[PDB]
Amino acid sequence: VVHEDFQVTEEVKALTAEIVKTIRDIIALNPLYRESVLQMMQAGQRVVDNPIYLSDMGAALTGAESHELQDVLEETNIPKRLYKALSLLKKEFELSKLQQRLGREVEEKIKQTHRKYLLQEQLKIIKKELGLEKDDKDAIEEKFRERLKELVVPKHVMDVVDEELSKLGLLDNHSSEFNVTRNYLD
Amino acid sequence: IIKKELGLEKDDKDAIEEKFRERLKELVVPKHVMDVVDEELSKLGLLDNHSSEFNVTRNYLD
Amino acid sequence: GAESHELQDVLEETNIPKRLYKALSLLKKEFELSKLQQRLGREVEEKIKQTHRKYLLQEQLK
Amino acid sequence: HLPLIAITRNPVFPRFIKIIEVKNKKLVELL
């Protein structure tokens, strides 16, 4: 078990601050486990006797493939393995942040769709006060009724027309089937 | 209150709506095509912008 | 982030200008340390970014 | 001089409590 290190342990511990801050960012933006353990083992408390163990624990949280773990274990120099662990953490962070960004993008698209639907409904309820049915074409329903009114008409055409009109009322305006029904009715 | 840029066509899920209206303003629009266009504009406003049916409606309107 | 030893050294100074200068120099030293760490980290980030964009594209493909 | 342990898709990170549950009972005899 090789633990060679430099005598001046003054600026080497600086990278520990960056490592712990990266771990904090990962857990906050990517909550996988409870955060109490991090509070239990605080760098300032000085109870970290072996920083290698803390680095391993921090990297253990990484979702990197076991192949990457073996590659890290291959390295012997402490700085090289530290940089490899930092790169692995960045690799996980990239995917996690991309997932969050894509999720929020899809959610925002859905929210915009729903909001514009709400604006359309406000149109249908304010300008189109319920009853007129100008856009729904029930006004056109009345128009066709009055058009048929004057005609001295056989019963067969009236029954088929009533069936067609009921179908038109059932079907929504934009349906292509509704369009064909409207054309046949006209 | 119910629409923006009144005295004209509302945005109605499709801004180019207004553009199309001016594209018809200089034209002496026959009444039959006028009502067909009004109905189709309402239909376009009823559908979501990114739907394929909305795309076909836009193509027909253009 | 000056160590407890440095804080005690600052407390040792008596003259107000002396401790002000010591605090300013400590800020200078810690800021230089942080700036060097930031520059080295940016260098390492760029060198890892040497991994062609095709690597990120392959991550997406998988 | 002991037979190799069948990890069976149970990675064990350093200084981290892990649980291994192998389907083969033969390891129970060694245990």
Full DSSP string of chain A: ------S--SSTTHHHHHHHHHHHHHHHHS--S-THHHHHS-GGG---S-HHHHHHHHHHT----HHHHHHHHH--SHHHHHHHHHHHHHHHHHHHHHHHHHHHHHHHHHHHHHHHHHHHHHHHHHTT-TT--TTTTHHHHHHHHHHHHHS---HHHHHHHHHHHHHHHHS-TT-HHHHHHHHHH-
Show which subunits contact A, needing at least 3 CB pairs below 8 angstroms: B, C, D
Distance from CA of A65 to the nearest CA of C (A): 13
Q: Which of B39, B42, B48 sits opposite A113 (nearest CB)?
A: B48
CA-based end-to-end distance of chain D? 14
For residue A57, the chain D residues in CB contact (below 8 A) are 13-16
For residue D15, the chain A residues in CB contact (below 8 A) are 53, 56-57, 60
Cβ–Cβ below 8 Å for B2 and A122: yes
Phi, psi (degrees; rounded to nearest 5) at C48 = -65, -35
Pair B44, B14: CB distance under 8 Å:
yes
Helix, strand or coil for residue C38?
helix
For residue A86, the chain C residues in CB contact (below 8 A) are 44
Instruction: Please report the resolution in angstroms.
Output: 3.7
Q: Tell me the technique behind this structure.
A: cryo-EM
Cβ–Cβ below 8 Å for D15 and A53: yes
Chain A CA closest to residue D14:
A56
Phi, psi (degrees; rounded to nearest 5) at A132 = -65, -45
CA angle A13, A15, A17 (to 5 degrees): 85
Query: Which distant-in-sequence residues (6+ apart) come within 8 Å of A4 by Cβ?
Result: A78
Cβ–Cβ below 8 Å for A173 and B45: no
Chain A CA closest to residue C49:
A87
Pair A127, A136: CB distance under 8 Å:
no
